[PDB]
Amino acid sequence: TQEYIQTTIQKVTVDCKQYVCNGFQKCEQLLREYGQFCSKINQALHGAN
Amino acid sequence: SQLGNCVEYSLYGVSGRGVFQNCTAVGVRQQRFVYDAYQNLVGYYSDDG
Amino acid sequence: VDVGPDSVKSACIEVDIQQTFFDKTWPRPIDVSKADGIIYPQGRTYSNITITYQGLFPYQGDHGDMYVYSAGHATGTTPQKLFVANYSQDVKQFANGFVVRIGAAANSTGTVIISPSTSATIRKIYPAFMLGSSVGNFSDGKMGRFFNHTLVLLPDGCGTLLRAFYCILEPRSGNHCPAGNSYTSFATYHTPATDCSDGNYNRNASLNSFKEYFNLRNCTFMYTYNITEDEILEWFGITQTAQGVHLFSSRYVDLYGGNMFQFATLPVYDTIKYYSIIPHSIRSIQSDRKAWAAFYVYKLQPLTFLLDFSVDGYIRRAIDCGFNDLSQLHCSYESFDV
């Protein structure tokens, strides 16, 4: 009987600031009004990894 | 004259609802409005001293 | 605004520019961890918290531009020629403004610039600035001329007042003046022997020397601010918004701490694009030369800093969140300890 058990997933991190705004300062300025969004993305993935 | 009560306030354009209490000064006096880490107004230096 | 009479002298004092003597290496870069160069968030205060904040800050590690004022030439008891650096011709782009570290070396033994073998205790001296919208050259081709209205920040009274004025500077045509013969650089000066009496300081000594090189015309304002004398390191800053030019200083709010707070707004609405340091030379006798502290100018930019507010609200420690990857880490967790 063959059985596969997954023990891991691929670990991924995201440069959220770059993902969302691509280096554009106007975007980054607007992104700040959404709070520490990217800190949350990074911390959630860091823990998951 | 209204310490301990819930009041509406408008202090030099800053407004909201809250309860004022007499307490020890923190922060820079010259800046008038003391904010917390979530940007709520948490203290105030009044013109009555 | 009436800013007093024009100078009546037919000539300016000759200025000796010898940059070699001012090419010193005395680095004092911004240490953000010690909260150097920080202008306090303007409309509010915080207590006992660590938060990130967006605003105009100097970069961590920025050496800035060092400027040092010196004693002029002398022969015994009769001061002669002024001795300066090539500062008036060194025009910088203003951009978002700047902060200045003033008197950092005070109380240390230093050098008299004009005489490298002579040592003296270093004393705080205040920077002089010329700022404006447009620049170009003077009659003989040297640069450093400002056109139209120019903002001049000129300390006076032997360091007891800051005089801020916005006016048109009309070069005078006399000997060694910018529209005349044998021009090198304009410079301001004071003569301690007659200007810095223990009691009555000459509150117009530097203004009067400025006036020897330029006629002040169409002044829209002239303001003075008082400075209590001390040898304490202080910070000065300048920014510009739609509301005018904002002058910041640590001495009226956080004298010992160094955080800068706004003390004045000037009605200067054209955009400042350029600035320069007005060289200053002290007409001391040969036997009484002092070492004057260098000042450092650092440029500001819209950076995010992690700011550590103490219980008393002052910023004592900070992180420049774009300095390096380690700094980015601290900022993302909004903490100095991760």
From Swiss-Prot, chain A:
This is Spike protein S2. It comes from Middle East respiratory syndrome-related coronavirus (isolate United Kingdom/H123990006/2012). The lineage of its organism: Viruses, Riboviria, Orthornavirae, Pisuviricota, Pisoniviricetes. The chain holds residues 791 to 839 of 1353 of the full protein. The gene is S. Mediates fusion of the virion and cellular membranes by acting as a class I viral fusion protein. Under the current model, the protein has at least three conformational states: pre-fusion native state, pre-hairpin intermediate state, and post-fusion hairpin state. During viral and target cell membrane fusion, the coiled coil regions (heptad repeats) assume a trimer-of-hairpins structure, positioning the fusion peptide in close proximity to the C-terminal region of the ectodomain. It comes from the Viruses.
